[PDB]
Amino acid sequence: ALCEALYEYSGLAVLRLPYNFLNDMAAQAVARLMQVNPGLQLLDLTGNEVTDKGAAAITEVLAKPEAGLKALILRHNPIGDTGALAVADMLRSNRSLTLLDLADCHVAVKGLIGLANALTAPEGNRSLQVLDLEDAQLAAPQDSTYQHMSRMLATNTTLTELSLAKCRLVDSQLELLTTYGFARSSARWSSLSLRANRLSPFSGPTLERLLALPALCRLQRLTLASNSLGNDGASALARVLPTACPDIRELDLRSNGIGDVGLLALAAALPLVNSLELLLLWGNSFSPASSRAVAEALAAPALRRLRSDLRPYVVDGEVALALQEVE
């Protein structure tokens, strides 16, 4: 087809095939091209029909210690456990990839165990800086993948951001991760994204312990959203945020059952943080008193450039009420 007949030599900083319903022989073609042409830095093949054969081709042409590539993005691809094992194997030999993005790719306990093992410090990779995993379908109570990821976190010293988005993540698993990987890690964590997990309000103490750590010192992009926290969780964030994370660039609490008491507690604690820029909290609940408090707080003189998804308007009776507001 059209894709397979691409022949280029010069430049090629990035390549973006957004979806284009790529076949797998087309993936073979792009891997063959990139093998015989060692010039490129970013490859993006999101949302294709690339199967394990094209995955194997790309992984094996990258496993060579020459013809470096830096960013590899493959989302929405039925890559399975065989593909996961192939990519872990190739990472075991590669040294140029810095961003591995495997999201919505159907990974199971076996494949993601392999991935977690392939980055333990001795035999792993100092190279990868951004490991993006998502939709790890551990629907069954599989309590071993998180132990292997905890070992990853304890040994590795090069990662800077990760996501457990839409990975089934009970508070027991999260407590295991927090303690056994973060109370022992030593790195610089930029972002940890936990949107859409199964988190109880009981996660207040463990979330507090997580956010008050030396390893998580310069935590910047925290996106703890879409879980099922509550007033207790909001209070925990309120009483741990102002001190522990000194420069947290953005905060995102969307769809947690925040209610109103947690909002009241967080209102009187938002002002003491001046490093917040993107504060995203819509879709929880807003009583008139809580809306009044948030209007009182958000407009605190110190917090000028604090973008949010709230606009506080006024109606009769001075019932200041907040609505949604796109960036």
Partner: protein, 84 residues
Amino acid sequence: KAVIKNADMSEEMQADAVDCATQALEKYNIEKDIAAYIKKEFDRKHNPTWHCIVGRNFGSYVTHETKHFIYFYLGQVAILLFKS
């Protein structure tokens, strides 16, 4: 950026439904085909019993299980996704 009209459901799988609709819209417009894609996605991720409707306007009366029903607007199509 879907709008949620009715919900008897958690939040994480609502987020899954919303961005599933976004991906399906990036992939197709044909109503049968987007409905099929969403159905397969939620028959795989969650154990296969679900089904959905993606209509510009219609009427519905169903018996979902106690904790699997969402009715949200996204893009241009009212999406009603429930379990049975």
